[PDB]
Structure 1
Amino acid sequence: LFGAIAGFLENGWEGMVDGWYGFRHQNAQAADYKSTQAAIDQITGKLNRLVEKNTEFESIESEFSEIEHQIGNVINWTKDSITDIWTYQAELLVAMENQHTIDMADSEMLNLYERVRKQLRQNAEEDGKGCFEIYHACDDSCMESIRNNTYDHSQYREEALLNRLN
């Protein structure tokens, strides 16, 4: 389990229907494409792995005619054991890949909270919220500059340092 979900974030936004991962902001809402794509491609990867899996089988037991009793209870025991095995394989599979699923969906959030952290650089500060604080007036252009992933910390450090230390 990574920090992001069911952790320092206390809530998920029902308003966001456009993507899994998003940006909200006070200013004077959007969602990141690449992160969602990264998180959905891997759900489709084991959706893909799961959907296509089979050997041809014949009818060893008969429906309409009584079979020899010893070979019949041997067939019943064999079938019952194969059924138990496959049920266990099944429950293990779904529990493992659900675990992996959630843990990853956490990881792809944190991977690009760690993008933003390292893009804002020293021009912003970490909070308990998980919702970054900007100390300098960024218009809708600065914020878009956050989300596109082109930007320049250089162009604002001289400014923001003055706001952090006074």
Structure 2
Amino acid sequence: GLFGAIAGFLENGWEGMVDGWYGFRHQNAQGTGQAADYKSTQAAIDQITGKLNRLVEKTNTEFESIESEFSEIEHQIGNVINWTKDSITDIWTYQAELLVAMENQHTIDMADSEMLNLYERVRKQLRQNAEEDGKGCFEIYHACDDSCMESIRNNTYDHSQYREEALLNRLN
């Protein structure tokens, strides 16, 4: 979208991923696996939580009545009161509508950015030992064991260890 990833170069989400918002799918020698990235997930939830905390929780000033529900009130004053309440309601409803529209735009777009941020993390960590599919995948030109996959997702992968090996498959 704004950050090109979610609903962008990734053409869909993964209904199977139930452990977190963001995650990895791998294919290798020992077969296929899936796993969620807890850290990026929590970056995104925490910000949502910050929004909710702002939304909820507001000290309100105390208001006493000015219109009697059961008495009759004088007509002119009643009309002025009505004008003022209606006017104030138009303001609040406009406000509430903008709040939600702008929050929602931002919320969607930050969710996109966290997804990108993770993608960019992995790309950098691979340096030259892999290249970019164009659809969220990194094609790994070396034997990346289940343990090696885990090292990527654990952000402990050492590109230097597989570098010259990987730089081979490069050209054939």
Q: TM-score, normalised by structure 1?
A: 0.98
- CA-atom RMSD in angstroms: 0.6
Greater share of residues in strand: 2
Deviation readout 1:107-143 (Å, 9 max, x if unpaired): 0000110000000110000112211111111111110
**Following TM superposition, where does structure 1 have runs of at least 4 consecutive aligned residues deviating by more than 6 angstroms?**
none
Q: Distance in 1 between matches of 2:124 and 2:169?
A: 19
Number of positions where the alignment pairs a residue of Structure 1 with one of Structure 2: 166
Q: Distance in 2 between matches of 1:94 and 1:26?
A: 41
The gaps in structure 2 that reach 5 residues or longer are: none
Q: Distance in 2 between matches of 1:152 and 1:26?
A: 19
SS of the residue 2:46 aligns to:
helix
Structure 1 counterpart of 2:38: 33
Q: Distance in 2 between matches of 1:44 and 1:128?
A: 32
Deviation readout 1:81-121 (Å, 9 max, x if unpaired): 00000000000000000000000000000011000000011
Q: TM-score, normalised by structure 2?
A: 0.95
Percentage of pairs with the same residue? 100
SS of the residue 1:25 aligns to:
strand
Q: Distance in 2 between matches of 1:158 and 1:71?
A: 86
Structure 2 counterpart of 1:16: 17
The gaps in structure 1 that reach 5 residues or longer are: none
Q: Distance in 1 between matches of 2:136 and 2:39?
A: 20
Identify which of 125, 132, 135 aligns with 1:119: 125
Deviation readout 1:35-86 (Å, 9 max, x if unpaired): 0000000000010011101110011001101100000000000000000000
Q: 1:25: how far off?
A: 1.1
